[PDB]
Ligand binder design. Structure first.
Ligand SMILES: CC(=O)Nc1ccc(O)cc1
Length: 121
């Protein structure tokens, strides 16, 4: 669910999901198109593609369980959807951590006309 993705992100990066990652670039937050602006935005793009592989799952509202084995994120067993949603979110959180160095404030609240492009998952 969206509440635990928020908490996973905070734990990984030290930044609050809202607003750091809810209006970033073209795909972080609320995103539908264009070319991802930078690495962090590519993380959001991949995250969206990952959810897109689960048409009969409800990522925003379905809750999963996970634990931290010394920093490593371990998804605990639940329903097939919960397991797969959890793996999508874990990947995104790690992707965010990996690209914190290039995170840029100029992409926050990024305008929708500047999202130009095409890209396939
Ligand atoms: C803050 C937060 O949970 N953001 C978020 C979650 C899922 C998604 O596909 C894009 C963004």
């Amino acid at each position: 669910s969206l509440l635990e993705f928020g908490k996973m992100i905070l734990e990984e990066t030290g930044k609050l999901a809202i607003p750091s990652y809810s209006s970033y670039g073209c795909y972080c937050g609320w995103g539908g198109k264009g070319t991802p602006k930078d690495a962090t935005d590519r993380c959001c793009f991949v995250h969206d593609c990952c959810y897109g592989n689960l048409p009969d799952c409800n990522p925003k509202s379905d809750r999963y369980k996970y634990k931290r084995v010394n920093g490593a994120i371990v998804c605990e067993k639940g329903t097939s959807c919960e397991n797969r949603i959890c793996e999508c979110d874990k990947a995104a959180a790690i992707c965010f951590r990996q690209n914190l160095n290039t995170y840029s404030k100029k992409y926050m609240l990024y305008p929708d006309f500047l999202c130009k492009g095409e890209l396939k998952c």
